[PDB]
Design a protein around this ligand. Sequence first.
Ligand code: A2G
Ligand code: A2G
Ligand code: A2G
Ligand code: A2G
Ligand code: A2G
Ligand code: A2G
Ligand code: NAG
Ligand code: NAG
Ligand code: NAG
Ligand code: NAG
Ligand code: NAG
Ligand code: NAG
Ligand code: ZN
Ligand code: ZN
Ligand code: ZN
Ligand code: ZN
Ligand code: ZN
Ligand code: ZN
Lengths: 99, 99, 99, 99, 99, 99
Amino acid sequence: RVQSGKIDCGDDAGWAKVPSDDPGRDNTRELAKNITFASPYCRPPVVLLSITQLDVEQSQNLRVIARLYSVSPSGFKASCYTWHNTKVYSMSISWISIE
Amino acid sequence: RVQSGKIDCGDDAGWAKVPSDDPGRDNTRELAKNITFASPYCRPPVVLLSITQLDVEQSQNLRVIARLYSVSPSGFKASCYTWHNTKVYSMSISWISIE
Amino acid sequence: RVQSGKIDCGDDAGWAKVPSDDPGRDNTRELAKNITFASPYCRPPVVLLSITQLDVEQSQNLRVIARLYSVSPSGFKASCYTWHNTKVYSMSISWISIE
Amino acid sequence: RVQSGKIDCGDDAGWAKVPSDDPGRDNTRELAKNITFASPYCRPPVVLLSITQLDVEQSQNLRVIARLYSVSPSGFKASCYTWHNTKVYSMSISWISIE
Amino acid sequence: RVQSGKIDCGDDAGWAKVPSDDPGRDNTRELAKNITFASPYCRPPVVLLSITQLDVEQSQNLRVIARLYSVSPSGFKASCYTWHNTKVYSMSISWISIE
Amino acid sequence: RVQSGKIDCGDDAGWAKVPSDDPGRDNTRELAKNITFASPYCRPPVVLLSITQLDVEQSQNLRVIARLYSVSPSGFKASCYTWHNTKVYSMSISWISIE
Ligand SMILES: CC(=O)N[C@@H]1[C@@H](O)[C@@H](O)[C@@H](CO)O[C@@H]1O
Ligand SMILES: CC(=O)N[C@@H]1[C@@H](O)[C@@H](O)[C@@H](CO)O[C@@H]1O
Ligand SMILES: CC(=O)N[C@@H]1[C@@H](O)[C@@H](O)[C@@H](CO)O[C@@H]1O
Ligand SMILES: CC(=O)N[C@@H]1[C@@H](O)[C@@H](O)[C@@H](CO)O[C@@H]1O
Ligand SMILES: CC(=O)N[C@@H]1[C@@H](O)[C@@H](O)[C@@H](CO)O[C@@H]1O
Ligand SMILES: CC(=O)N[C@@H]1[C@@H](O)[C@@H](O)[C@@H](CO)O[C@@H]1O
Ligand SMILES: *[C@@H]1O[C@H](CO)[C@@H](O)[C@H](O)[C@H]1NC(C)=O
Ligand SMILES: *[C@@H]1O[C@H](CO)[C@@H](O)[C@H](O)[C@H]1NC(C)=O
Ligand SMILES: *[C@@H]1O[C@H](CO)[C@@H](O)[C@H](O)[C@H]1NC(C)=O
Ligand SMILES: *[C@@H]1O[C@H](CO)[C@@H](O)[C@H](O)[C@H]1NC(C)=O
Ligand SMILES: *[C@@H]1O[C@H](CO)[C@@H](O)[C@H](O)[C@H]1NC(C)=O
Ligand SMILES: *[C@@H]1O[C@H](CO)[C@@H](O)[C@H](O)[C@H]1NC(C)=O
Ligand SMILES: [Zn+2]
Ligand SMILES: [Zn+2]
Ligand SMILES: [Zn+2]
Ligand SMILES: [Zn+2]
Ligand SMILES: [Zn+2]
Ligand SMILES: [Zn+2]
């Protein structure tokens, strides 16, 4: 069984600063969301993320990650992530889960 | 059952102007395609879109959406979508459908 | 049955020049990877690729393709691909395979 | 998708005489039932029948068939079947359908 | 997901007398077994029973039922059942469960 | 994936005597068939057998087994089996295989 949805991260003025896990990256920032499946699994499904909306400032490099932090039978944690001097005006992630 | 394919939207000189559904966005433009499954379903499958080709002008912001408008047992409507002064030289969407 | 993973292509200083399959594109370059499933299929699965990390130079156009070259019951060939004067500092592809 | 149920044919005093399709068999008799799935398929499912109740007269040979006549996406035709001088006091068929 | 196994009820000298649920039947007797799946489901699977071994006394009528009492995500209750003056020397039930 | 079919064992005058695997049973006889799937699996499917035709002599006890000897990705070995002084005029086994 298969479910899908979309996460809208919005403008990065709304994202949280987080510690960087890469010493070559600073000003690491993200919008993390815990998603609850509209039907829990008995064991974690496979999840794939896709970036289906981007609005990014041209005067600075494009730096984006769609992160999948963890997955459980009832949902998952994912984030829109950026760093350094990138400005993201909007980013959305589509996802699918397959049992 | 699982199907996949790719939609090539090409250069936005070929896209249609459409009414904007967001008053903060103007010059909204898209390449819409109705895809017919190579095997109809009995009820709509789950569809996920992925942007697997982008060629975008660096002097203006990157603004892209891969839209899924609707899905039926025999196919779906999807578009490459941009707005304002972005120039897209090519954009392609890969898709998968899962019954 | 469903498998997934991620391919990290890294900085394009590490990519290979390849012959261009499009006369309108030069300096065609890619990082190709042959992935071996953590469980072989009896006939090729359906595979979808998603670009889940991009770090690209703003002073030149964004030009990226996530290519799926071929798929077999035991794995597939995919690449991160760019051309002309684009500079990619990092690119990663997430994939899912469904029997 | 998987469905199941049971057909109770009861005492053969209630069965219909039918033409014999085997010249070595006479007094061919059956209880035929058309079953409608509690959820139609798009193409015929695979159906298996199992005889899960028998009450048969010991003074004559045991002669029973559980017949599957035909199967469609929305149901199937099955019968309890006997012949010659057998007496069946009750017979029930359990079935399963798998898409 | 699909599991199967077999229940051997043996000689009815080993079966339990049970109250009859049919006033037309007396001396109702059965061998009931609670089966635990070799892998629990999240919600009850569909189960089908099949009588795959019978050794029955010819001087009395053949009277047998393979009963499915109940089914849960982790197993099911089934019995070999007879009544009146039938003698069963052995009876075995094969089963399959499909999620 | 799901396949089914039927094995017709016919009159036991055609069955082979086999060594008995039970010292309490003599004159052990069977009709063994190796079935080849109309589509090989990559690993053995689950198989269930059902006795869907019986014609047995009333003057001797009913003694029948539907045996599943072994199963492989491309087929299985099954038999109609009887013993002692039982006479089987016809026996047929229906089967289903589920990947
Ligand atoms: C300190 C920091 O975040 N540095 C970043 C580096 O991580 C990389 O993204 C580069 C190319 O875009 O831009 C900056 O140098
Ligand atoms: C009117 C219009 O389309 N305005 C756009 C806005 O929607 C947003 O995309 C922004 C950042 O890229 O660029 C412009 O201001
Ligand atoms: C020769 C070559 O690669 N030319 C490229 C062309 O293929 C297209 O990518 C364009 C817009 O970004 O940029 C350059 O003109
Ligand atoms: C004419 C007729 O039905 N004949 C039947 C034959 O078909 C077979 O069932 C046999 C053994 O039970 O009993 C009778 O001879
Ligand atoms: C009281 C009782 O169990 N009566 C049984 C009846 O239920 C039915 O099985 C019949 C034919 O075999 O044999 C007997 O009459
Ligand atoms: C030696 C032999 O096969 N003996 C059989 C025994 O196995 C059992 O089937 C019994 C009741 O039907 O009938 C005979 O005694
Ligand atoms: C969100 O749920 C995930 C489980 O997938 C857990 O790892 C994470 O820490 C949770 N955080 C919050 C604040 O809900
Ligand atoms: C395309 O098909 C979709 C159904 O998925 C429908 O909603 C849409 O309006 C159709 N448009 C055209 C012109 O085919
Ligand atoms: C990688 O494996 C693929 C099969 O999917 C094959 O087409 C390709 O040429 C192989 N190349 C290398 C050097 O392994
Ligand atoms: C019952 O439905 C079946 C289709 O599976 C058809 O073949 C059969 O003749 C029907 N008969 C009656 C009277 O409904
Ligand atoms: C066996 O388990 C079933 C559940 O499927 C329950 O209904 C039944 O009463 C149990 N009985 C015993 C004694 O275990
Ligand atoms: C039939 O094939 C089975 C494999 O399922 C094997 O065990 C058996 O011995 C074979 N016998 C014959 C003579 O084909
Ligand atoms: Zn800097
Ligand atoms: Zn502007
Ligand atoms: Zn140039
Ligand atoms: Zn006769
Ligand atoms: Zn009596
Ligand atoms: Zn004897």
